[PDB]
Structure 1
Amino acid sequence: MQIELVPCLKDNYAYILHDEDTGTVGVVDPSEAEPIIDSLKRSGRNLTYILNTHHHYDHTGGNLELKDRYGAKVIGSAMDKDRIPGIDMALKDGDKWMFAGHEVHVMDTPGHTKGHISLYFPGSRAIFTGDTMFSLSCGKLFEGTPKQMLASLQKITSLPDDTSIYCGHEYTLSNSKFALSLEPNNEVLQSYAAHVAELRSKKLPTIPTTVKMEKACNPFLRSSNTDIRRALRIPEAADEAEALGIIRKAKDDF
C-alpha cells in the first residue's frame, strides 16, 4: 500500500491510501475536499473510501463533498456515529475492516476526544493515530482524561517498534522545543530535534515517525523519567496518568 501525505489547511495531514493490486483508494482525515481532489486527478483515480479518526472539523470537513463527488463510503467510529458526517460504516474497538483485502485493526483511542479511533494496518507496519499521538506530543484533552490518554498511548506503543506512525498534524518542531525544555540530556531527542529543524527549514514533513522514536523522545511516553518529573515538580509518588496530566497542562501553557 502506498501512503501519500496530503497537507491540508495550515498543518493538517490527510493520507491517501493506494492499494497496488486493485487501485482501490482511501483517504484518512480529509480536512478539505479540494487538496484530495487535486491529488486524485493527478493519479487519475476515483476515491473508494473515506476514514476518519475523530469528529473534529479539521479531520471531517471534506467528507460530504468527497462522498457526494465520488460515491465514496465513509468509515468511522461507532462511538461517534452521530458526529461523523456521511458515515456509512461504524466500527468498534478490535474490529477488523478490509481495505481491498488488507486488514485494518480498529483501536479505540480516547483522550483528545471520546470516540477517537486509530487505524492499524499491520501489513504495512503503519498506524494512523489522528490527534491521539503526534511526533513528540499527544492531543490536547478536550473530552477525555489523562488516564484515557495514557491508556491510548500505551495501546499504540505496544505495537512493534518498527511501526510507522502517521498523525494528524505537523506539530513536531514546536513539540520538540517543549520536549527539550524537559529532557535536555536526552541525546536521541537532541539528534531527532535537530533533524526535525532541518526538515522544517526546507518545508518537508516530519511524518511518519515510529514507535521506537516516540518511545525514545516523546515526553508523554516518558512520564516516569526523573528529569521530566524534576523539571515539572511532578512528585515521585504520582502515577503515570497523573504525571501525563501535569505534562499536558504544562505544554498547553508553554
Structure 2
Amino acid sequence: MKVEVLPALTDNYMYLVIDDETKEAAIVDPVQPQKVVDAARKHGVKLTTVLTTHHHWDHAGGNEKLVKLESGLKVYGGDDRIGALTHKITHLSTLQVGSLNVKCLATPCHTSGHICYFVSKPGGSEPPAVFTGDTLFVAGCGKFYEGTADEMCKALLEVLGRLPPDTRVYCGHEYTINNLKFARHVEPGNAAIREKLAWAKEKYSIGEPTVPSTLAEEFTYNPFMRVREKTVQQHAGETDPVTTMRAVRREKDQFKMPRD
C-alpha cells in the first residue's frame, strides 16, 4: 500500500491510495481533479474509486468534475449531500481497492454524515492507514458544526481510538502548527507537544506535509484525544470527558494564536 499526499487549495489534503498488487487506486476528497489525474498518470495507476469523507465543498466539490474526466468511477460517501454519489455507505460498510480492504467508520459530529476510511492489507505486515477528514487532525479536531461534545468523544475515543496504535493518520487540513500552539496552552508541562511543534515548524519551512501522524502519537499531544487525562480536566475545570471536551472546544474556538 502506498499513500501519496496531494496538497489542494490553501491548506487541504487529498490522498491517492495505491494498491501495490494490482496498481488500482482510490482518491480521498478530490476537490482539485486535474491534480488527481496528473498524480495517477505520474504513478501509472488506474483510478477506480472515490472515498468522500464529508459533504463540505473543500472535500466533495470536485466529485462532479472528476466523474466527467474519468469514466467508470465508484463514488463512496455517507451523506446524500455529496456530489456525484454512487454508493451510499454506513458504519462498518466494506469495499475493496484491488487487494486492499477498506472499512467505513461513522464519525458524526463535524458533519452528521462524516465517514473515516480505515485501509489495510489482509494478511500483510505493513501498518494500516485511517483517512479522518475533519474529525481528527494532527493535534486537533473539527469544529462541531452539526454535532455535540458527546459525539466527538465517541468518534475520537471509541471509534478511532480503538484502532491499532500504529495506524497512520491522514487528515483533511494542514492545521498542525496552530493546533499544537493551542495544545501547549492547555498543557504547558507536556514535552511531547513542544517537540512535535518544533518538528512541525521545520516541516512548514521546507514545504513538506505534517501527515501522517500515528494514533499513538495523537494520544501523547492532542488535547481532544486526551480529555480523560487529569491535566486536561483540571485545565478545563471539569471531571469527566464530555464536559471537558465541550469546554476545550469552546476555548479553542475563541483562542488567539501566538506568533511563535
TM-score past 0.5 threshold:
yes
Q: Is the 8 A contact 1:114 1:144 kept in 2?
A: yes
The aligned counterpart of 2:114 is 116
Corresponding letter in the other structure for 1:131: D
For residues 40-75 of structure 1, give each alpha carbon's deviation from its aligned partner in whole angstroms, at most 9, with x where no partner exists: 232344421111011110001111111111112211
| Greater fraction of residues in helix | 1
Corresponding letter in the other structure for 2:210: T
Does 2:128 match 1:130?
no
Q: What is the distance in 1 between the residues matched to 2:235 and 2:149?
A: 19
Which of 156, 170, 182 matches 1:153?
A: 156
Q: What is the distance in 1 between the residues matched to 2:82 and 2:8?
A: 19
SS in structure 2 of the partner of residue 220 of structure 1: coil
Query: Within 5 Å, which residues of 2 pair with 1:130-209?
Result: 130-154=133-157, 155-209=159-213
Q: Is the 8 A contact 2:228 2:241 kept in 1?
A: yes
Q: Is the 8 A contact 1:46 1:70 kept in 2?
A: no
Please, which runs of 5 or more residues in structure 2 have no aligned partner?
122-126, 256-260
Please, which runs of 5 or more residues in structure 1 have no aligned partner?
none
- Larger mean Cα displacement after TM superposition, 191-200 or 210-219: 191-200
- % same residue: 38
Corresponding letter in the other structure for 2:153: L
Corresponding letter in the other structure for 2:171: C
The aligned counterpart of 1:7 is 7
Q: What is the distance in 2 between the residues matched to 1:235 and 1:76?
A: 36
Per-residue deviation at 1:192?
Answer: 1.3
Does 2:101 match 1:103?
yes
Q: Is the 8 A contact 1:14 1:27 kept in 2?
A: yes
Per-residue deviation at 1:203?
Answer: 1.6
Q: With the length of structure 1 as denominator, give the TM-score of the two structures.
A: 0.93
Q: What is the distance in 2 between the residues matched to 1:157 and 1:243?
A: 17
Q: What is the distance in 1 between the residues matched to 2:43 and 2:227?
A: 43
C-alpha RMSD over aligned residues: 1.3
Corresponding letter in the other structure for 1:247: V
- Larger mean Cα displacement after TM superposition, 191-200 or 214-223: 191-200
Corresponding letter in the other structure for 1:249: R
Q: What is the distance in 2 between the residues matched to 1:43 and 1:30?
A: 17
Q: With the length of structure 2 as denominator, give the TM-score of the two structures.
A: 0.91
Q: What is the distance in 2 between the residues matched to 1:182 and 1:90?
A: 39
Q: Is the 8 A contact 2:18 2:45 kept in 1?
A: no
Corresponding letter in the other structure for 2:13: Y
